[PDB]
C-alpha cells in the first residue's frame, strides 16, 4: 500500500507535463497528479535573470503554434491584449560581411558577383539532377545539396548545421525535416538575382507572439496556475528517485510512496532508465546521442543601433564566431532588460577592456542572446566561451569595440537538443515499446528524443495527446507523425470541448 | 419546445449510424437517440431471403477490418467461435476462357503468347515513362495506363470499371485510390511470365470471416441489439420527414419533434437537402454523380461443381455478361441457402428453358450472387436483367445450359455506389462546411458521398469518429485521411477505453 | 554529228561553274567548255555599281572558307597582299532600341531585367527537357525553342527567320543546321546575365577577308581569267537554249550544238527540267520552294558616324523595318564607294524630303546595304520597298532624318534562296538522282538546291566536287554530306597535287 | 644517286600493299614500284596448308565488302561464278551445353529460365538507365553493359571478349566499335523469351563470298598477277633492311638502294621505327599494345556431323576451352579439304588416344580452324596449346572422343590484333604525324595500328585511299572516318573511273 494513489501520473511540469496535467484536469475524470523537483513551474522553458535586471530564455525558436488547443490554454494563461506583444519573423544569415535576408538562397544578390556565379551553377546542377532522381536522400547532407546545389549548401546549411548539432550534416537523419522533395526552387533563385533584389520570408502574415512579461518561463507558470494547487507537488518534496515499474510505484526524495495505474514521464529518458534500475534500458539510452548547449546573455548600454534595427534572430554559417544563432531579445519586450532609467555601471568593453569609470550610468539598454552547441565531435571551452561570444559579436559588427557592456549570463544545458542521428530510430523503436509495455508513457524533448516535436507547442500537444490515448483512446498522432500534424490546421481538440460542453 | 430533446440525434441505422450510436452508448455521457425509418437495423448493410430460402446480400466486398474498435463491436455482437466461418481471399478474373487468378498482371502467363506479348510490350513503355515523370496521374484512367501499360489496361480495368461504375475511367479521379505511386512492376510480372508461375495475393494469412447466419445483415441486428432500446426509435416511428437546421429540430412522419445540440445524419447527403428544404443544398448536391446497382441471385441444385471450387469472388471485364463481379455466396456459410434435405422444384434451366415436371427434388444447393451498375451513361434494362444474368453464367461456363435452377432474385438499389468523379471534391467541400456550419454531422457511404471510405469497417468508423469528434474533439481521420487509416493498425480506440476503467473504481 | 564536241561540258559561271572549269582545268585531262549567258563571269556573285559609283554585292554573307583548295584559288586569283582588307567578324542584333552583340542570348544582360527574367525562365524550361529528351526535333522552330527556350525564341530566332526565308519556321526542316544538339547553353547565359557581361563571338581570330576592289565581283572575275580563254564562251554567244539530254547534246542562242559525254549544269535546276523538255522533271521542280531576295543600297553623305562604328553586319527580328540584315558595306572597302573629293547632289534626306540645295558637294561617303526577302507567304510592296528601307533605317536609328542621301540601289533576285522546306529532300531525292542517271550532275545554289552548300566556298566546291566524282571517282562530300566537310579542316585537296607534280617531271 | 629511282614506293603487299598497287596501276601516272619479302604475294591474309592436304587461313572474319572497288578488283581476279562460293552468315555462341544463335540476346530462350529472369532483370535496369542516360560510354566494358545489363554482359561479351583480345574489356576503348547508341532493345529480347522463339542474324541476303581455290589467299596471289610484274620485287631481293627517312632512299637486304618522293609503308610501325633508326619513334611505337594469335587446324575423318551442319563460325565465352572462335572450315569450300578418295592414316583419336590401326583409310574429311589469343595479361603455353585445342573441341561436343583426327596444324602470329587500348589514340596522333611529315605514308593493319580498319577490305581501301591522296587530292576516310565509310555505300570510286574512259 503506497502513501498516495492516483490513476494518472504525471512526471515533469516542461510543457510536456503541462500539457498532460491540463488535459487531465478538462477532463476531470481520473485522479492524477503532477510532480516535479522544481517549485517553479516550466521545467526547460523557464526564465533566467541576472543580477543586473536581464531576462534570457534558453532558446532561439519563438513560438509557432500548430494547434488550436495550445492557443486556447495560452490564451487562458494569459487573457489580457497587453500580455503579448506581437512581431514580424525577422531573420538574416550573416555571411561575408553582409546580414542576408532568410531564405538565403532568395538573397544571394548581396553576394559578389563571382561567387553569385558559383552558386547558380550548383543549383542548375541541382535541378537538373532531381528532374530525374529516383531515390529519396538518406542523410541530412544529401538533402542539403539536393535541396541548394554544392556552392549554396557550402557558404550556409552545412557549416551552420555543424555549428548547430556539433555532429556533420553526414551522421544526421533527414525524416524529421517533413516530406518536401529534396529540389531547388531554381526560379526563384535566379530571379531574384536577376532582378538584384532582396527579400526577407516576413510580412504582416508572419508573426510571432512574445509574452510581455517574465520571458517563454511567464507562460508556463500562468498555464501551471490554472491547475488546481493540491494536485501538484512542486520542489524537493516532488523530486522522483526510484521508479517500480512491475510494482507502478514511484518513491520520491522525502520517501512519499505513489501508486499509479498509467505513469506519464516527462524526464529525460535515460533518467527514466536509470530511475527504473532497468539495466537493458540503461544500455539503449546510453546510445542516445545528444549535444549540449551553451547559451550567453549580453547587456549593452544604448539605444538600438541602427545596424540592428528589428532583427529578430540571425543564423551564422561563418568561424568568426562560435555562436550558431544569435536573438535581439530586447527586441521581444521591454520587460526583458531595465528600463531607460535603471542605472548600472559599465563591466567591460565589447572590445574587452575597462570603461573609463566604474560609475552607475543610466540606459536605455538592449540586450543579446548567444546559443553555443557542444559535443563530443565538437568541445568548448566553458572557461573561455564567454569572452569567445564577445568577441564574436565584435567580429560579426553586431557590437562596435566601443560598446558598453553591462551585464552577461552564462549556462550550460547538458542535455541541449536531442540529435537526428542516422542511429536515433533505430534506438528509440527498441526503447519506446519497452517502456509501452510497462504502461508508461515517456514523452517530450528527451522524453521521446525526437527533436522535430521537441519544442513548446509540440511538447505540449505530447503530453495532451499522451493523456488522450490513455483515456479517450486517440491517436498519438505528434509523437508519430510529426508531418501529419505539421501539415494541417490541427482545430479539432479544444480546451472546452463537447464533453464539458453537455455535462453542465 | 420539442417533444424529445437530446444532446446528440442520429439519422440511419446503417453502420455508420450504428457506429455513432455504439460510441455514443461506451461513453454515456451526452444524451442521444438513434432514428431509423426501418424496423429491421443495418440500414443497407442487411440481407435479403428469397422465398425458397436463398440469402443475398448487397454487394461482393467483403470484410476487411482496418480497426480494433471495429473488430471489438463485431466481436461482441458474435462472440461465438461458431458465429463465424473464415475463408481464404480468393478471387479471380474472367478472360478469355480462363480464370485468371488475381492480381491480373501477374497471371498474364495463362493467356495466349501473343497477348502476354503485347502486355509486357505495353508495360515496358509505362516502366520508361514512369522513370521521367515528373507530374502525377490527373484522372483513373491515366493511373491505370501508367500503373499497368495500354495492352493490360484494355484487357481488364478499363473495360472491367466501366462495368463497376458505370462511367468511363476518364471521367474519375484517383485520389481514392490511396497514395501509391503510378508505376508499373515490370520485373515482378516479366518474371512470372518468364518462369510460367501464376500467383494468388491469398494464403492462410489472407483471410476474411463471414458471419455463419443471416449474412451481413446479422452482423448489425446483432451490434444494434446491444443498444439500449428505449434510446432507438426503428420503423415508420421514426421516418423523418423534416429537418428544420436552423430551429435544430427535426420532424417524423407521425408528427414527434426532436431538438438536438448536434446532427448526425447518415441519410444520403442529397435526400437530406430535400428534407432541409435548403435550395442552395438541393442545386449542389443534384450535381453528385451516382450509380444503380442491381443485384441477381441465382439458386442452383447440385452439389457445387468442380470447376467452380473454392471461388470467392470473380471479375468480369469482357461483355459477354452484363456483371461486372459474382460471388459464390454458398461458399460463404452453409446456412447461407436451404440444406439439402429441402425439397425445391426446377424454376428452370440455365439456358432459359421449362422443365419437364412440376417435382420437387432434394439438393443441395449452391448460389450465386451478381451485380450489375446502371447510370445515365449505362442504361439497364429491368425487365430482362435477370435473363440477361443467366445466360451470362452460361456464357462464361459458371453455368451449364442443363443447371437447374431453383430460385432467382432481383433487387435495385437506387444509390448504388457514390462515384468519385473528376467533380466530386469541388462539390463537397461546397456542401460538407456548410452543414458542418450548422452542426450537422452529414457521414457515411452517402452521408458523406465518398466511395473509398463507404464500406461497412470505414462507414462505421466514420459513425464513431464524428462521435468522438463532437464529444472528445477527436480528429475525423476516416473523412479526411483514408491513405492515413488505411496504412497504419489503428489500435488505439477500443470498445472498452481507459475512461470507462478508471470509471468503474 | 554536232558543232562543237567535249568530254565534260560545264553550264554557268558563277562560283560553281568556275569550281567545275578550275578542276578540269588543273587535272587537264578530258575535254571541256564553260557556257555562260553573261559577258561578264561570276553569275549571282556578281557586283552591281551605281551610277554615283557605290558598288552592291547580292548578300551579307561574308566569305568563310572550308577548303583549302578554295583559297588557293582566291590566291592564285588575287595574289597580293592589297587585293585583301581583313577585318574582324563583327555582328548585332537591333532590340528594343538597343545593338545587342552576336550571339544574342549571350547578351541579353543589355535588355530590362524583367525581360531577362523571362528569357531565364523559359531557357530553364528548355534545359529541363532537354535533360529527358530523346527525340530531335523535326522542324526549325522545334530546333529553335529546345536551343533558346520560348522567351528568347520569340525575341530573336523566330521573327528574324521568318523575315529571312519569308516562309515560318515550322515549315522548314532542321538538318541544315548541322548535327548539334538542340539543348541551352543555361550556365553560360546565367553566367553573362549575372556578371553583366556582354561579349561577341569576334576578335582578332575571327576575321574574314574581303576583295579590295570590285566587290566579290572582283574575286569571280579573277578567278575566270586564270582559265583558257578558248574553252570559254560568255555572253550571247553562249546561251543555251535547249538540253537533249537523250542524245547528249546542247544548243546555244546562236544555233550552235554541243556534244558532250558529261554534263554539269550550275543554272537553276527549274529551268534546267524546262530547257529539257522533261515534263516529269518540270512537275517535279516545281514542287521545291524558293523565296525572292530584294537588295537596297543606300550612299550616304558624311564621314562613318560613331553610332555605327566598326559594325559589319547587322540583323533586324524587328516590326519597325522590311530587311532582316543591313551591312556596312563601306567598312569592307574604301573602294566600295566614291572618294571624298567626289561631288554628288543630294537626293534625298532620310526622312524622305527634298533637299536644301541642289548642288553637287563633296563627302566622304559611306554605304548601306539591305537585304528583303519576299514569297507567295510573305510578299512585299515592290513599289515602295526602297522608301520602306529607308524609313526603316530611321527607325532603327542608323540615319538621322537629316542625313543626305547621294545613291540608291534596288535590284529583285528572282531565284533568291532556296527554301530548306520539309519537303525539299523528298523532291530532291527524285529530282538528282533521275539527272544523274543520265549523266547530268546539277549542282549549285539553285543547282542542286540545297541553301546549305549554296553560298560561295561551299558552291565551288560543289563544281570542283562533281568534276572530281566524274574523273576520279570522288565522292562528292559537300553535296552530300555538308556537316561533314564543315566539321573538319579540308587541307587534302590542292590546286597543285601530286599528279601535277609528278608529271612536270 | 640511288640503284633505282620511282615517284612512290611501296614496302610490302599484303591487302594494303596490293590497294596501293592497283591504284597506281590504274592511274598509271607517277612511277611506282612494290616490294615485299616474300616471294608469295597476300601478306597475312596468305594461306598455309598441312602436309596431309588441309588448308588454313589466318582468322575466321569472312569478308564483307564497304566498297564497289574492292569489288571490282576481287571480281577482275576472279571473275568465273565457280572461283567463288556463297554461304549464308552462319554463328552461334557456344554456352551452358547450347548452341545459342548469333546475337545471343534475341536467343537468351535456349537457357534456363531462373537465368532467363537474371537475364531480363539486368537489361530492364540498363533500359531504365538509357532513359536518363546523358554521357557516352568511356570504356568498352561500360558500353557492353550499356547495351545489354549485367546478366546477358556476364553469360557472353565479357569473358568472350577477354579471350578475343587477351585484355580486360575495361582497358579499352569503344570508339572502334562505332557510333550507335550503347541501349538495349529491350523489346526485341523480352519478346523472343516470351514467344520461346530463337532467331539468327542470317537469310538468303545475309551471305558471304569464299574463293573455290587456295584459301583466301588465292583472292591476292590472283589479284597481284594483274600487276606489271617489272613494277613488283618479291622475295630476298625485295626484304627492306634500312629506311633512311631524311633522303628518301630504302635499302634492301641485297644492297640495292631505292629512291622515292613519297612513301607507303605496310610494315608494323614498330618495324618501321627501327628500319629509319628513329629512337623518339622506337619509344612511342613500343607503347603501342597488341596480343599474338594462334591459330590451330584440325583434320577430321567422315562425313559432316548433323550436329555440326551449316554452321560456319562459332563464339565461345567459357573457360572450358582455350579458342575464342572456330570455324567450320571444310564448310566455305570443297577444296580446303582433300577429296572423299584421299587415304590418310589417323593421327590420333579426338580423346587424345591412339587408333587402332596405322592404315591410310579413305574419307570424306572435314576441318576446323580455331583462334587463340596471347599477351602479358593472358599467357599461352606454346608447347600444350594444341592438345589444349583438341580438349577443348572434346569439351563444347564439336567432337566425339571417338573421332579420326587426320592432321594438325598450329602457328603463331607475333603480331595477331593490334589493340583498342584506351591508349592507343593517344600514342598514334604522335606517331603517324611525324611519319607524315617525312611524306611516309604508314598504313595497314600494322601499318597505321587500328584494328577496326585492319581486316582484308579495309586494308585494302587504306592502300587505295592513300594513293590517292598522294596523287588526286583526296581524303583518306577509311583511316579517319571508318563510321563514315561503314554506314555508306561507297560505289564512287571503280577500278575504271571517268579519267581511263577519257584517256582512251
Chains 1, 4 share one sequence.
Not at 484536469?25 to 543580477?51: F, K, Y
Not at 549540449?292 to 568561424?319: A, M, Q
Not at 527533436?451 to 486517440?474: K, P, T
Request: a negative charge; aromatic letters at 10%; hydrophobic letters at 35%.
Amino acid at each position: 500500500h503506497p502513501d498516495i494513489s492516483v490513476d494518472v501520473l504525471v512526471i515533469g511540469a516542461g510543457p510536456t507535463g503541462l500539457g498532460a496535467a491540463k488535459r487531465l484536469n478538462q477532463i476531470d475524470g481520473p485522479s492524477w497528479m503532477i510532480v516535479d523537483s522544481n517549485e517553479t513551474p516550466g521545467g526547460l522553458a523557464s526564465t533566467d535573470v541576472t543580477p543586473e535586471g536581464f531576462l534570457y530564455d534558453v532558446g532561439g525558436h519563438v513560438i509557432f503554434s500548430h494547434y488550436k488547443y495550445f492557443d486556447d490554454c495560452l490564451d487562458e494563461a494569459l487573457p489580457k491584449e497587453d500580455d503579448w506583444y506581437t512581431h514580424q519573423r525577422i531573420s538574416y544569415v550573416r555571411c561575408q560581411g553582409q546580414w542576408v535576408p532568410y531564405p538565403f538562397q532568395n538573397n544571394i544578390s548581396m553576394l559578389p558577383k563571382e561567387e553569385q556565379v558559383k552558386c547558380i551553377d550548383g543549383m542548375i546542377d541541382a535541378a537538373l539532377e532531381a528532374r530525374v532522381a529516383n531515390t529519396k536522400p538518406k542523410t541530412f547532407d544529401e538533402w542539403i545539396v539536393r535541396m541548394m546545389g554544392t556552392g549554396i549548401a557550402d557558404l550556409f546549411m552545412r557549416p551552420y548545421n555543424f555549428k548547430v548539432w556539433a555532429v556533420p550534416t553526414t551522421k544526421m537523419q533527414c525524416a524529421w525535416l517533413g516530406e518536401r522533395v529534396a529540389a531547388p526552387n531554381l526560379k526563384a533563385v535566379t530571379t531574384n538575382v536577376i532582378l538584384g533584389k532582396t527579400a526577407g520570408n516576413w510580412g504582416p502574415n508572419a508573426t510571432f507572439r512574445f509574452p510581455a512579461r517574465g520571458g517563454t518561463g511567464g507562460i508556463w507558470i500562468a498555464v501551471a496556475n490554472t491547475l488546481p494547487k493540491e494536485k501538484t507537488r512542486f520542489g524537493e518534496k516532488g523530486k522522483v528517485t526510484k521508479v517500480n515499474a512491475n510494482n507502478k510505484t514511484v518513491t520520491l526524495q522525502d520517501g512519499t510512496t505513489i501508486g499509479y495505474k498509467k505513469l506519464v514521464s516527462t524526464m529525460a529518458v535515460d533518467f527514466l532508465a536509470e530511475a527504473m534500475n532497468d539495466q537493458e534500458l540503461v544500455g539503449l539510452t546510453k546510445q542516445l546521442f545528444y549535444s549540449s548547449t551553451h547559451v550567453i546573455g549580453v547587456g549593452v548600454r544604448g539605444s538600438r543601433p541602427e545596424r540592428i534595427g528589428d532583427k529578430c534572430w540571425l543564423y551564422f554559417p561563418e568561424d568568426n564566431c562560435p555562436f550558431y544563432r544569435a536573438t535581439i531579445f530586447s527586441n521581444y519586450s521591454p520587460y526583458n532588460q531595465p528600463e531607460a532609467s535603471a542605472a548600472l555601471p559599465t563591466m567591460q568593453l565589447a572590445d574587452g577592456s575597462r570603461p573609463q569609470s566604474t560609475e552607475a550610468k543610466e540606459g536605455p539598454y538592449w540586450s543579446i542572446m548567444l546559443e553555443v552547441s557542444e559535443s563530443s565531435m565538437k568541445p568548448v571551452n566553458q572557461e573561455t566561451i564567454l569572452a569567445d561570444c564577445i568577441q564574436g559579436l565584435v567580429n560579426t559588427e553586431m557590437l562596435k569595440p566601443t560598446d558598453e557592456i553591462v551585464s552577461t549570463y552564462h549556462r550550460r544545458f547538458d542535455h541541449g537538443y536531442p540529435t537526428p542521428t542516422l542511429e536515433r530510430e533505430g534506438t528509440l523503436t527498441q526503447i519506446l515499446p519497452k517502456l509501452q509495455d510497462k504502461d508508461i508513457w515517456s514523452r517530450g524533448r528527451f522524453g521521446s528524443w525526437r527533436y522535430e516535436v521537441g519544442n513548446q507547442d509540440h511538447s505540449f500537444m505530447l503530453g495532451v495527446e499522451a493523456v488522450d490515448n490513455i483515456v479517450n483512446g486517440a491517436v498519438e498522432l505528434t509523437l508519430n507523425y510529426p508531418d501529419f500534424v505539421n501539415g494541417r490546421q490541427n482545430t479539432e481538440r479544444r480546451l472546452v470541448d463537447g464533453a464539458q460542453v453537455f455535462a453542465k
